[PDB]
Amino acid sequence: FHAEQEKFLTCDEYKGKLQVFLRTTLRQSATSATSSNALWEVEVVHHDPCRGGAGHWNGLYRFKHLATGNYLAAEENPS
Amino acid sequence: AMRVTLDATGNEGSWLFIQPFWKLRSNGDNVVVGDKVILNPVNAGQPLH
Numbered sequence: 001f002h003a004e005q006e007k008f009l010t011c012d013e014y015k016g017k018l019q020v021f022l023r024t025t026l027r028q029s030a031t032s033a034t035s036s037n038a039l040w041e042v043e044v045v046h047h048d049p050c051r052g053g054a055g056h057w058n059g060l061y062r063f064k065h066l067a068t069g070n071y072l073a074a075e076e077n078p079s
Numbered sequence: 080a081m082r083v084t085l086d087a088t089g090n091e092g093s094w095l096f097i098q099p100f101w102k103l104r105s106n107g108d109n110v111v112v113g114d115k116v117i118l119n120p121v122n123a124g125q126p127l128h
């Protein structure tokens with residue numbers, strides 16, 4: 001949840017591809033705008049693939065879209 | 080606007096609420112050094128500009 005804009009990070013298909021965006025809502029309570037497409041699973045990086053456990057501030061994390069299964073990442077901007 | 084000055088003795092006009100300028104800060108949270116805040120006079124009601 002991005003507080004400054006009071007928006008949830010959501011991934012959904014627009015034309016033919018999945019894109020990550022912040023969804024605008026008309027609800028008075030921004031936190032009440034809950035959607036299934038805005039659900040992410042937190043993965044803690046561990047040398048053991050099958051090991052999870054509690055995270056640390058100095059650790060590494062991955063974010064996986066629960067609905068689609070893809071992973072959050074960054075790529076080159078066309079502009 | 081309303082006048083802002085310095086008074087040796089002071090009065091009720093020196094009362095200033097320290098309000099969070101960032102949405103990530105909420106009332107009752109401890110103020111962290113280096114943060115940006117709003118100084119709102121209690122009686123005047125208009126933040127320092």
Ligand SMILES: O=P(O)(O)O[C@@H]1[C@H](O)[C@H](O)[C@@H](OP(=O)(O)O)[C@H](OP(=O)(O)O)[C@H]1O
Nearest residue numbers: 023024025026027028029030032033034035
């Ligand atoms: O106030 P009402 O008449 O109940 O209407 C609700 C709300 O005002 C929005 O229309 C919508 O929120 P979004 O803008 O986030 O779609 C929400 O849908 P939801 O049930 O899908 O949250 C509605 O239920």
